[PDB]
Amino acid sequence: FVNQHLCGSHLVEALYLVCGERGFFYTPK
Amino acid sequence: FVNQHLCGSHLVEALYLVCGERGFFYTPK
Amino acid sequence: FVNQHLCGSHLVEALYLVCGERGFFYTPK
Amino acid sequence: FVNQHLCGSHLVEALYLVCGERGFFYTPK
Amino acid sequence: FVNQHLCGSHLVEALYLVCGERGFFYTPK
Amino acid sequence: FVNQHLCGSHLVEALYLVCGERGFFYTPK
Amino acid sequence: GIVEQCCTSICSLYQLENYCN
Amino acid sequence: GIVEQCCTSICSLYQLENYCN
Amino acid sequence: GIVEQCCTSICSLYQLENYCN
Amino acid sequence: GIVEQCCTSICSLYQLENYCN
Amino acid sequence: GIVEQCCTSICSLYQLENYCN
Amino acid sequence: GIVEQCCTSICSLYQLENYCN
Ligand SMILES: Cc1cccc(O)c1
Ligand SMILES: Cc1cccc(O)c1
Ligand SMILES: Cc1cccc(O)c1
Ligand SMILES: [Cl-]
Ligand SMILES: [Cl-]
Ligand SMILES: [Zn+2]
Ligand SMILES: [Zn+2]
């Protein structure tokens, strides 16, 4: 599960950057 | 400004960890 | 070994957040 | 304050890399 | 100073993502 | 490919730290 | 919002949980 | 969702931008 | 230690808090 | 350089692309 | 401590090694 | 390059310093 947890940390960093002022929801499924 | 962008980066990483499976929302100002 | 090195980087970030003012030792075994 | 929290985050990541197998201690102020 | 070191850390992570396969150059001041 | 993308994010952080004022090029091959 | 609240002062993990889904 | 999509395969900045608000 | 425990399996914030000072 | 330009003000992703190879 | 020393000024990697175990 | 070298095997801070300018 750890691999997925690690990946997700980078995902959210990337959305933070890409979404900018729009913001985002993070909903892992 | 930049300082806020920097702060935000760390808040999303902290929300990622805190909120776990619930996920989170990030809405900047 | 790289997987472990990557995991450990996130571990310490997480302890930083969770431990707060208490601080922590990082001793990988 | 926040700026210190931010600084600290980056110091632990840098101690993680610098110190390698020795590991490190992080004690905030 | 420190604030610049901190800023730089986040710029390289953002260049890593933005630039993708092209890679990037990072030259501080 | 994701594993490699994740690794590369930490690589660049590490070069940022190690290279200091010298700077660096990141050219993934 | 979370920036006003947590970039101007430091937020506990408890306070951060306010922004969990 | 995003974990399925982008942790099994790389997503570009354009693919990521779908998950934005 | 922590690498064995938490890199072979996810640890929550409560499991991590054992390694604190 | 990129620090002058992007640490004193916030850079779009477009502006950051100037420092891509 | 390391915050006083390295958040008020920038620490070399050599200086950081002081806080290694 | 660096991905081949250091993502298949750990590189120390000295091995990384080869890729610097
Ligand atoms: C930016 C990024 C992070 C993690 C996984 C991806 O597919 C993309
Ligand atoms: C927070 C975190 C990071 C890395 C591994 C874990 O199991 C937990
Ligand atoms: C510092 C670091 C990061 C990623 C991979 C490595 O081999 C070394
Ligand atoms: Cl990772
Ligand atoms: Cl920062
Ligand atoms: Zn990672
Ligand atoms: Zn930062």
Side-chain angles (χ1 to χ4, degrees), chain C residues 10-27:
Chain C
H10 288 278
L11 282 169
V12 297
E13 296 162 19
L15 291 178
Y16 173 73
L17 169 70
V18 169
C19 311
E21 83 183 338
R22 293 173 276 180
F24 61 94
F25 271 64
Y26 175 73
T27 86

mmCIF file of all heavy atoms in Angstrom, chain C residues 10-27:
data_model
loop_
_atom_site.group_PDB
_atom_site.id
_atom_site.type_symbol
_atom_site.label_atom_id
_atom_site.label_comp_id
_atom_site.label_asym_id
_atom_site.label_seq_id
_atom_site.Cartn_x
_atom_site.Cartn_y
_atom_site.Cartn_z
ATOM 1 N N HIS C 10 9.713 10.443 2.820
ATOM 2 C CA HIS C 10 8.349 10.789 3.230
ATOM 3 C C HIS C 10 8.126 10.507 4.710
ATOM 4 O O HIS C 10 7.400 11.237 5.344
ATOM 5 C CB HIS C 10 7.371 9.932 2.422
ATOM 6 C CG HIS C 10 7.359 10.425 1.007
ATOM 7 N ND1 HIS C 10 6.655 11.493 0.508
ATOM 8 C CD2 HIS C 10 8.114 9.978 0.004
ATOM 9 C CE1 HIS C 10 6.880 11.603 -0.765
ATOM 10 N NE2 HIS C 10 7.795 10.709 -1.087
ATOM 11 N N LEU C 11 8.725 9.396 5.217
ATOM 12 C CA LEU C 11 8.638 9.093 6.655
ATOM 13 C C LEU C 11 9.120 10.265 7.466
ATOM 14 O O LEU C 11 8.563 10.674 8.466
ATOM 15 C CB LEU C 11 9.519 7.921 7.097
ATOM 16 C CG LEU C 11 8.969 6.552 6.771
ATOM 17 C CD1 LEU C 11 9.984 5.432 6.973
ATOM 18 C CD2 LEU C 11 7.676 6.306 7.480
ATOM 19 N N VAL C 12 10.303 10.794 7.094
ATOM 20 C CA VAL C 12 10.769 11.823 7.979
ATOM 21 C C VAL C 12 9.878 13.046 7.876
ATOM 22 O O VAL C 12 9.832 13.809 8.805
ATOM 23 C CB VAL C 12 12.259 12.190 7.810
ATOM 24 C CG1 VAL C 12 13.073 10.974 8.146
ATOM 25 C CG2 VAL C 12 12.591 12.736 6.468
ATOM 26 N N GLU C 13 9.318 13.321 6.695
ATOM 27 C CA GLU C 13 8.446 14.484 6.581
ATOM 28 C C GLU C 13 7.210 14.371 7.500
ATOM 29 O O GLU C 13 6.699 15.298 8.136
ATOM 30 C CB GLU C 13 7.916 14.611 5.131
ATOM 31 C CG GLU C 13 8.951 14.883 3.984
ATOM 32 C CD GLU C 13 8.509 14.598 2.522
ATOM 33 O OE1 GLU C 13 7.262 14.509 2.233
ATOM 34 O OE2 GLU C 13 9.397 14.440 1.633
ATOM 35 N N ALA C 14 6.723 13.148 7.539
ATOM 36 C CA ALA C 14 5.566 12.789 8.357
ATOM 37 C C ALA C 14 5.823 12.869 9.863
ATOM 38 O O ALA C 14 5.044 13.481 10.589
ATOM 39 C CB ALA C 14 5.107 11.386 8.003
ATOM 40 N N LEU C 15 6.995 12.335 10.294
ATOM 41 C CA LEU C 15 7.374 12.545 11.684
ATOM 42 C C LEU C 15 7.520 14.021 11.979
ATOM 43 O O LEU C 15 7.175 14.437 13.048
ATOM 44 C CB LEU C 15 8.733 11.850 11.927
ATOM 45 C CG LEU C 15 8.787 10.347 11.904
ATOM 46 C CD1 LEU C 15 10.241 9.807 12.128
ATOM 47 C CD2 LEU C 15 7.904 9.815 13.004
ATOM 48 N N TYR C 16 8.124 14.792 11.056
ATOM 49 C CA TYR C 16 8.299 16.209 11.338
ATOM 50 C C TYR C 16 6.923 16.780 11.701
ATOM 51 O O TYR C 16 6.730 17.530 12.653
ATOM 52 C CB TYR C 16 8.972 16.951 10.158
ATOM 53 C CG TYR C 16 9.047 18.440 10.304
ATOM 54 C CD1 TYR C 16 9.941 19.013 11.191
ATOM 55 C CD2 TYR C 16 8.169 19.269 9.615
ATOM 56 C CE1 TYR C 16 9.991 20.399 11.359
ATOM 57 C CE2 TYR C 16 8.196 20.624 9.775
ATOM 58 C CZ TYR C 16 9.079 21.189 10.689
ATOM 59 O OH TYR C 16 9.149 22.539 10.802
ATOM 60 N N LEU C 17 5.927 16.361 10.930
ATOM 61 C CA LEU C 17 4.601 16.979 11.099
ATOM 62 C C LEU C 17 3.949 16.480 12.391
ATOM 63 O O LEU C 17 3.377 17.230 13.149
ATOM 64 C CB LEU C 17 3.771 16.635 9.835
ATOM 65 C CG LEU C 17 2.271 16.941 9.899
ATOM 66 C CD1 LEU C 17 2.092 18.445 9.889
ATOM 67 C CD2 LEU C 17 1.440 16.258 8.771
ATOM 68 N N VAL C 18 4.023 15.193 12.565
ATOM 69 C CA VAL C 18 3.346 14.545 13.703
ATOM 70 C C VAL C 18 4.035 14.863 15.036
ATOM 71 O O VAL C 18 3.419 15.273 15.974
ATOM 72 C CB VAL C 18 3.302 13.022 13.528
ATOM 73 C CG1 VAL C 18 2.876 12.261 14.757
ATOM 74 C CG2 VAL C 18 2.421 12.654 12.349
ATOM 75 N N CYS C 19 5.360 14.845 15.056
ATOM 76 C CA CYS C 19 6.006 15.093 16.324
ATOM 77 C C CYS C 19 5.926 16.536 16.808
ATOM 78 O O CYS C 19 5.986 16.801 18.008
ATOM 79 C CB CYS C 19 7.433 14.528 16.377
ATOM 80 S SG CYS C 19 7.526 12.806 15.831
ATOM 81 N N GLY C 20 5.870 17.485 15.897
ATOM 82 C CA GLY C 20 5.843 18.889 16.230
ATOM 83 C C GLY C 20 7.023 19.329 17.087
ATOM 84 O O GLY C 20 8.130 18.936 16.835
ATOM 85 N N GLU C 21 6.754 20.114 18.147
ATOM 86 C CA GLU C 21 7.803 20.650 19.001
ATOM 87 C C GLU C 21 8.551 19.538 19.741
ATOM 88 O O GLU C 21 9.580 19.782 20.340
ATOM 89 C CB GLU C 21 7.202 21.619 20.032
ATOM 90 C CG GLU C 21 6.633 20.869 21.232
ATOM 91 C CD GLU C 21 5.949 21.703 22.303
ATOM 92 O OE1 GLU C 21 6.252 22.932 22.357
ATOM 93 O OE2 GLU C 21 5.092 21.121 23.065
ATOM 94 N N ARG C 22 8.013 18.326 19.823
ATOM 95 C CA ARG C 22 8.716 17.283 20.533
ATOM 96 C C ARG C 22 9.995 16.913 19.810
ATOM 97 O O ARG C 22 10.942 16.419 20.384
ATOM 98 C CB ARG C 22 7.859 16.041 20.620
ATOM 99 C CG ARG C 22 6.617 16.231 21.492
ATOM 100 C CD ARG C 22 5.724 15.015 21.397
ATOM 101 N NE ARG C 22 4.835 15.062 20.237
ATOM 102 C CZ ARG C 22 3.955 14.115 19.929
ATOM 103 N NH1 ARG C 22 3.894 13.044 20.701
ATOM 104 N NH2 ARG C 22 3.153 14.231 18.877
ATOM 105 N N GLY C 23 9.968 16.951 18.491
ATOM 106 C CA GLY C 23 11.144 16.503 17.763
ATOM 107 C C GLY C 23 11.198 14.980 17.706
ATOM 108 O O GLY C 23 10.281 14.322 18.164
ATOM 109 N N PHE C 24 12.266 14.458 17.143
ATOM 110 C CA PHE C 24 12.355 13.032 16.893
ATOM 111 C C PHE C 24 13.778 12.677 16.532
ATOM 112 O O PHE C 24 14.576 13.507 16.126
ATOM 113 C CB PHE C 24 11.431 12.594 15.741
ATOM 114 C CG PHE C 24 11.702 13.210 14.377
ATOM 115 C CD1 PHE C 24 12.521 12.552 13.450
ATOM 116 C CD2 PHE C 24 11.089 14.414 14.004
ATOM 117 C CE1 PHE C 24 12.797 13.085 12.190
ATOM 118 C CE2 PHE C 24 11.390 14.985 12.739
ATOM 119 C CZ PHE C 24 12.211 14.288 11.836
ATOM 120 N N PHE C 25 14.095 11.391 16.632
ATOM 121 C CA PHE C 25 15.313 10.822 16.118
ATOM 122 C C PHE C 25 14.935 9.998 14.905
ATOM 123 O O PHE C 25 13.942 9.297 14.897
ATOM 124 C CB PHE C 25 15.940 9.829 17.099
ATOM 125 C CG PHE C 25 16.883 10.491 18.054
ATOM 126 C CD1 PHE C 25 16.424 11.432 18.966
ATOM 127 C CD2 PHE C 25 18.245 10.226 18.008
ATOM 128 C CE1 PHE C 25 17.303 12.075 19.834
ATOM 129 C CE2 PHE C 25 19.122 10.890 18.851
ATOM 130 C CZ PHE C 25 18.647 11.832 19.746
ATOM 131 N N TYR C 26 15.724 10.068 13.878
ATOM 132 C CA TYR C 26 15.481 9.165 12.768
ATOM 133 C C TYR C 26 16.635 8.184 12.736
ATOM 134 O O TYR C 26 17.768 8.588 12.557
ATOM 135 C CB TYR C 26 15.271 9.930 11.445
ATOM 136 C CG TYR C 26 15.147 8.987 10.271
ATOM 137 C CD1 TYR C 26 13.992 8.249 10.112
ATOM 138 C CD2 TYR C 26 16.153 8.821 9.353
ATOM 139 C CE1 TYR C 26 13.860 7.347 9.070
ATOM 140 C CE2 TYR C 26 16.029 7.938 8.288
ATOM 141 C CZ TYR C 26 14.893 7.195 8.168
ATOM 142 O OH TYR C 26 14.755 6.363 7.117
ATOM 143 N N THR C 27 16.299 6.925 13.015
ATOM 144 C CA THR C 27 17.293 5.864 13.021
ATOM 145 C C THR C 27 16.758 4.724 12.150
ATOM 146 O O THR C 27 15.935 3.894 12.549
ATOM 147 C CB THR C 27 17.664 5.427 14.442
ATOM 148 O OG1 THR C 27 16.687 4.453 14.779
ATOM 149 C CG2 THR C 27 17.712 6.555 15.458
#
